[PDB]
Design a protein around this ligand. Sequence first.
Ligand code: MG
Ligand code: MG
Ligand code: MG
Ligand code: MG
Ligand code: MG
Ligand code: MG
Ligand code: MG
Ligand code: MG
Ligand code: MG
Ligand code: MG
Ligand code: MG
Ligand code: MG
Ligand code: MG
Ligand code: MG
Ligand code: MG
Ligand code: MG
Ligand code: MG
Ligand code: MG
Ligand code: MG
Ligand code: MG
Ligand code: MG
Ligand code: MG
Ligand code: MG
Ligand code: MG
Ligand code: MG
Ligand code: MG
Ligand code: MG
Ligand code: MG
Ligand code: MG
Ligand code: MG
Ligand code: MG
Ligand code: MG
Ligand code: MG
Ligand code: MG
Ligand code: MG
Ligand code: ZN
Ligand code: ZN
Lengths: 120, 91, 114, 69, 149
Amino acid sequence: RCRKNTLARRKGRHMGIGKRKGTANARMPEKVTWMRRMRILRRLLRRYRESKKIDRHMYHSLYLKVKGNVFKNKRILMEHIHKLKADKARKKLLADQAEARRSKTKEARKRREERLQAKK
Amino acid sequence: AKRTKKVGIVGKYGTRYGASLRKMVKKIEISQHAKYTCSFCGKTKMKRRAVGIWHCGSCMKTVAGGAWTYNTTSAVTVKSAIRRLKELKDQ
Amino acid sequence: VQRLTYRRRLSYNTASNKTRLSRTPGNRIVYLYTKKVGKAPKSACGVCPGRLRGVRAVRPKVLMRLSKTKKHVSRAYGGSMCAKCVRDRIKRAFLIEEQKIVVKVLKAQAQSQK
Amino acid sequence: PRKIEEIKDFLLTARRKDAKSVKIKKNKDNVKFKVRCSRYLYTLVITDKEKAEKLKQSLPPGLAVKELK
Amino acid sequence: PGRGAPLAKVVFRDPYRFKKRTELFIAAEGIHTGQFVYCGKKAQLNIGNVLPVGTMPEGTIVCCLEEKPGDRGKLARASGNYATVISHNPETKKTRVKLPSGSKKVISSANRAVVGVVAGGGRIDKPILKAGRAYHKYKAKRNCWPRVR
RNA sequence: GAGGUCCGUAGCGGUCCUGACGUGCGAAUCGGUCGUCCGACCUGGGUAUAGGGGCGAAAGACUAAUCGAACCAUCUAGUA
RNA sequence: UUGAAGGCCGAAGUGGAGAAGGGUUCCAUGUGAACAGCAGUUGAACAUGGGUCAGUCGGUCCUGAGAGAUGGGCGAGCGCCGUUCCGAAGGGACGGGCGAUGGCCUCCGUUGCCCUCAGCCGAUCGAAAGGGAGUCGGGUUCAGAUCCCCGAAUCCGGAGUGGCGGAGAUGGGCGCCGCGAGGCGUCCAGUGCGGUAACGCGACCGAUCCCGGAGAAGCCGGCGGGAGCCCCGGGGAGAGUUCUCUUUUCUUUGUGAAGGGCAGGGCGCCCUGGAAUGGGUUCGCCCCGAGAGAGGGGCCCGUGCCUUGGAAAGCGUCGCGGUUCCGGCGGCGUCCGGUGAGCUCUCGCUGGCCCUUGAAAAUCCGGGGGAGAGGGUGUAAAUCUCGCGCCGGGCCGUACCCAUAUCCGCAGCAGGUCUCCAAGGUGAACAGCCUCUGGCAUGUUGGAACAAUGUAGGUAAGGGAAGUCGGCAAGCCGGAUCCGUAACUUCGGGAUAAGGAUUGGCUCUAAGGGCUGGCAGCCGACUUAGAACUGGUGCGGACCAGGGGAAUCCGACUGUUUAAU
Ligand SMILES: [Mg+2]
Ligand SMILES: [Mg+2]
Ligand SMILES: [Mg+2]
Ligand SMILES: [Mg+2]
Ligand SMILES: [Mg+2]
Ligand SMILES: [Mg+2]
Ligand SMILES: [Mg+2]
Ligand SMILES: [Mg+2]
Ligand SMILES: [Mg+2]
Ligand SMILES: [Mg+2]
Ligand SMILES: [Mg+2]
Ligand SMILES: [Mg+2]
Ligand SMILES: [Mg+2]
Ligand SMILES: [Mg+2]
Ligand SMILES: [Mg+2]
Ligand SMILES: [Mg+2]
Ligand SMILES: [Mg+2]
Ligand SMILES: [Mg+2]
Ligand SMILES: [Mg+2]
Ligand SMILES: [Mg+2]
Ligand SMILES: [Mg+2]
Ligand SMILES: [Mg+2]
Ligand SMILES: [Mg+2]
Ligand SMILES: [Mg+2]
Ligand SMILES: [Mg+2]
Ligand SMILES: [Mg+2]
Ligand SMILES: [Mg+2]
Ligand SMILES: [Mg+2]
Ligand SMILES: [Mg+2]
Ligand SMILES: [Mg+2]
Ligand SMILES: [Mg+2]
Ligand SMILES: [Mg+2]
Ligand SMILES: [Mg+2]
Ligand SMILES: [Mg+2]
Ligand SMILES: [Mg+2]
Ligand SMILES: [Zn+2]
Ligand SMILES: [Zn+2]
């Protein structure tokens, strides 16, 4: 009888407003929930940092954000990581293109100056 | 977030002992529970062990000082006056 | 479940009356009376908070049965003072003696000058 | 109790003067020789049957041997 | 327990046999561990040293004053208290001292005294907020606290 | 995650019913209802304080069912 | 009394075991005069006999708060004060010298005398909960077991000849002989080695003296690891149900102490190297040029696992015997996994609180020093905290009760009396209510009826404090979730203010994670939110569980008080 009722309760029955005596904190403590979420998010960030999906500086920044409670789940945090990676990659690509063009101009000027000096 | 308007550390006394007593104990409480910088290592690891005894967590150095402050103005003025007295005595 | 009793005539939860549970080869659970947890020696320097290393941490009267190697380490002040403070003591003694030699020779020079 | 992993040192222990008896335990996958000295019981464990029997004959003659089951 | 001032445990070396002697001083404020304190007639004048009151210059601040020579310190040894060396008198070898009660006393000029103020000052400035604090304060001293009118 | 902090178990206590009983279960108990419950907290053992004395967060309270001066023997067959 | 049936205690017990106290009440046999407020074939009654086994459980030892001698002082005096204070307060010792003795007078021992060295804080008492080396498993009685028997250990003390082994410690040079291997002679060294380091190896000399450690410590919070218990998924073995169903329900499914190894924890331990684009990291913190992150090591704990013990034993089952008197004989089996803000115990890290800082001593150990000793190259010597071997461990306590009947209260008295262990469900919960293990017989009697008056419970139409000194007493409210919350205020509170709504069953949906190789596979554990349907509107259905508001007086508050008005 007891484990028939527990199977029902695992499917979700007998757990409504009427059949609850303790507070929400008494039933599931909010400290325990917070500690679980912190361990999950810290572990994900450490796995990403050791697998090189992100670097140390980004890791530290959103580690402090996790401590500051801006992410609610695991998936929300990983999507934020994806967006940050996309933006960082685009900005890096633009910077490299611009600096390649700048280096071309600089070395062409140097080459023109040295052939002018060879003339003189 | 900011949780109290006036009362700080003395928020633990509730509505007891009187507003003036709570106010005049607040500053002493802050002073005795503050962390001070060690003059011997430069770290801020000075804790009051017991009344008059201050300890450094890094140096493991122990200093005799005030009851609620690391040192008192009476102590510092006595130290300066004694230095001047020795200077005059040895000329 | 099987809930059990003490085995001695001391029925109070004092420091000496501490027990642990063990399952016997007769498929029963009993108390065994454990020994009080010993501590490694503290350094004679009086500064380092940590314990010494290489020395067994046992209740003091058990140290009679141990051999010497399990009680000390092979170094000056072995098993009585930590390596860091040993090396600072060596350095301090040497440099102090050097400074004393320097002040003596300066005193001799001043005596010659006067 | 002590476990002896070698054979000739166990033979020395058997020839020791304090050895009162040797008892032979024959269980599946294993053969154990137990010598009762003054302070410890010494067990030699070997997994080969013909090695076990040649050791049994090689045991000293004047020491009481007892196989048990 | 029972005293506001902390105690400084100090080690000297015996000048007559191979031993080290441990002692307890009323810790002057500003002292610290690993410090060298000097004891005797002609130790220089700085915090933590002890020397006869007849040698120190007038105006000196003193703790653990010795009211008779050899008494090993009787006067001004509570947390934050001190005495002042007012004036000297070489003939008859006597010194005037101002005590923490405001009184002035004539003292033999050959008894020791610690330089500095007693540590732990400002202890009475914090209000005991409750009878529990007062109870624990007096439990470590003696059985006198819950006074009845 | 602080507090001589709140509700509330065990413990500690003893409000009201002026309930039960009142030649009682009992020379002070019983029921329901109550107060407090991390502290000036509760408690065993050891130990100190002895009668015009002790001890008392103070009611003349407690000091072996005895307390605005304990108990025992004696003066004592005290005096009326 | 036995069996069956129906109930209760309900793991903060009506269970199993101790301390104080009791003193034979313990166990067996017999009896029914007296006692057990009825009775008794029964008894804690009476009469006969039995019953308490220790090097390793405690006392004995230590000192604490304190008590108490001697010296001294006081005292008419019995005596008192006093505990380091007005004492010539030591009867010990390495060694050296002298004198004698025994033993193969070797070398030592007993000594007798002298030289030399020597702080104790005061004799002594004070804890069966403090300190304090070292024993566990199975079996055994009628009543005793860490005490008896079996088997495994371990501590302390002792040992001329040390009983043996190993260490010390056994090498180098030169010169001869030898083809060489190897050996002979001279000299000389030899109180141990390895690692950069933290440290390691089985030993690895050393006195008076000095230094240090352990013994040796508060309360509270949080987190982590390890167990035991509980829970889940399957294998067995045995029992229950089988009118229909249920690959079903219940019970059971071991390994000690002491060694060895390995996990798993902890490090304020070492080496390389040098960090701002500051980084590492916790539930919280916290850390770093006084050396972080990153690599590589070292140490401590190790109650967990494997192993010696160990399967020989235990347990569960099936079956033969002894018709018996059996530690009888046998078969078989004692398996493989997962989980957890679970509960209890324990180990560890870290933080908070103190005008509170949270014992002493016996005892043991390590270090610094270097007075000394050993042998001259060996058959080596002094010396060994190394491995085995030999002997011993005296004295007292030990039965039982421990509490609605073995104790105190005059008694089998509803009072009082210090602790340990602690299952399932519901539930926030060690609350209340029901059950299992264990226990019990309703509390110093039964039977027949169901008047009054009582004691303890309930319910009442319409009204709703008109009752009464006085809403006394009872009643209303009650849990949780979602809203919402005033005057006043010492700005902390008031506050669960006040006032509303919801709450069952069933079937679903969504969100919240690990391990392996923005994907895939395999695993999971509990929660929260939302929806449809549905019941005679019923749902915190029993249990548990705040009536509220507006003011006045007094005492700030927490706390204490006339044991029995
Ligand atoms: Mg004890
Ligand atoms: Mg070692
Ligand atoms: Mg008092
Ligand atoms: Mg409270
Ligand atoms: Mg309360
Ligand atoms: Mg009353
Ligand atoms: Mg009445
Ligand atoms: Mg009556
Ligand atoms: Mg008197
Ligand atoms: Mg009182
Ligand atoms: Mg009178
Ligand atoms: Mg019981
Ligand atoms: Mg019993
Ligand atoms: Mg009987
Ligand atoms: Mg009768
Ligand atoms: Mg006396
Ligand atoms: Mg004694
Ligand atoms: Mg004892
Ligand atoms: Mg085991
Ligand atoms: Mg590092
Ligand atoms: Mg078997
Ligand atoms: Mg040396
Ligand atoms: Mg017994
Ligand atoms: Mg009845
Ligand atoms: Mg009956
Ligand atoms: Mg009865
Ligand atoms: Mg009505
Ligand atoms: Mg009605
Ligand atoms: Mg009226
Ligand atoms: Mg009327
Ligand atoms: Mg009422
Ligand atoms: Mg109000
Ligand atoms: Mg008024
Ligand atoms: Mg009041
Ligand atoms: Mg009264
Ligand atoms: Zn510092
Ligand atoms: Zn150190």
